[PDB]
Enzyme design. Structure first.
Site, PDB file in Angstrom:
ATOM      1  N   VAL A  97     -44.394 -20.133 -16.728  1.00 19.67           N
ATOM      2  CA  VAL A  97     -45.900 -20.537 -16.547  1.00 19.67           C
ATOM      3  C   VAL A  97     -46.103 -20.078 -14.882  1.00 19.67           C
ATOM      4  O   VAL A  97     -45.412 -20.027 -14.101  1.00 19.67           O
ATOM      5  CB  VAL A  97     -45.944 -22.149 -16.393  1.00 19.67           C
ATOM      6  CG1 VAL A  97     -47.460 -22.543 -16.136  1.00 19.67           C
ATOM      7  CG2 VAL A  97     -45.271 -22.802 -17.599  1.00 19.67           C
ATOM      8  N   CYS A  98     -47.328 -19.344 -14.902  1.00 18.78           N
ATOM      9  CA  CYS A  98     -47.676 -18.732 -13.611  1.00 18.78           C
ATOM     10  C   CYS A  98     -49.021 -19.901 -12.971  1.00 18.78           C
ATOM     11  O   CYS A  98     -49.437 -19.983 -13.770  1.00 18.78           O
ATOM     12  CB  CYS A  98     -48.160 -17.409 -13.661  1.00 18.78           C
ATOM     13  SG  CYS A  98     -46.725 -16.358 -13.410  1.00 18.78           S
TER      14      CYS A  98
END
Lengths: 77, 156
Positions: B90-91
């Site tokens: 996840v960014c």
């Protein structure tokens, strides 16, 4: 109506058939969708000129099978 | 050395006060001891969204530079979400040390920011081709897939 070869640095060649008066922003949308790349992360060039959204094929003097070049400034995100 | 102390302070605080439905527990080593550098977490879906009913587990991995450096958040298994890599990673702006990461950001603030990210994706920086396509074309198909994976990860 003219066909345009849209080339990228990644050797991607996607062809689009557009009207001579439609705003070229639609072709950016069709490149964003067909490649799954965010539209705001791409630069479109005709000759050495960044293609604006209100630019039209008729205004830029484009002809059949002309080439548009695409660059992606976001090398990572 | 400071990371293990900061992570131990966070574990105690999470036990006492943490948002409802969330999970955040340190994993164990092959010898049974506690590993404060690897946490197994879970983020619950918000009611009224296509995510409701599903409990999406992810893993928090902490480096020795914590909290000066952010942790790496990977959904396990990978989630159908426009801002989740096909690897599950996840960014988020708070998860980039060269962006909005500050050493004061706790584990609680990261899991809540990822929870908000589920129903409100950042369409300007997609990290997954499939979910960014469906979201920008057939939104109905996007919702159907989310609800299908929400029922897939529903606490049975």
């Amino acid at each position: 109506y003219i066909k345009l070869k849209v080339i990228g640095q990644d050797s991607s060649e996607i062809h689009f058939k557009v009207k001579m008066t439609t705003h070229l922003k639609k072709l950016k949308e069709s490149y964003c969708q067909r490649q799954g790349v965010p539209m705001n992360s791409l630069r479109f060039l005709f000759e050495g000129q960044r293609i604006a959204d209100n630019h039209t094929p008729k205004e830029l003097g484009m002809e059949e099978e002309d080439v548009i070049e695409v660059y992606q400034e976001q090398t990572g995100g | 050395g400071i990371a293990l102390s900061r992570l131990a302070q966070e574990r105690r605080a999470w036990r006492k006060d943490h948002p409802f439905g969330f999970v955040a527990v340190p994993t164990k080593n092959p010898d049974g001891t506690m590993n404060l550098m690897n946490w197994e977490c879970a983020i619950p879906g918000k009611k009224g969204t296509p995510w409701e009913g599903g409990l999406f587990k992810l893993r928090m991995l902490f480096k020795d530079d914590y909290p000066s450096s952010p942790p790496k958040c990977k959904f396990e298994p990978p989630l159908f979400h426009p801002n989740v890599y096909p690897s599950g990673t996840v960014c988020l702006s708070i998860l980039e040390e060269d962006k909005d990461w500050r050493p004061a950001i706790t584990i609680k603030q990261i899991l809540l920011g990822i929870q908000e990210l589920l129903n409100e994706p950042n369409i300007q920086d997609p990290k997954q081709a499939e979910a960014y396509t469906i979201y920008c074309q057939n939104r109905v198909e996007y919702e159907k897939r989310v609800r299908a994976q929400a029922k897939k990860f529903a606490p049975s």
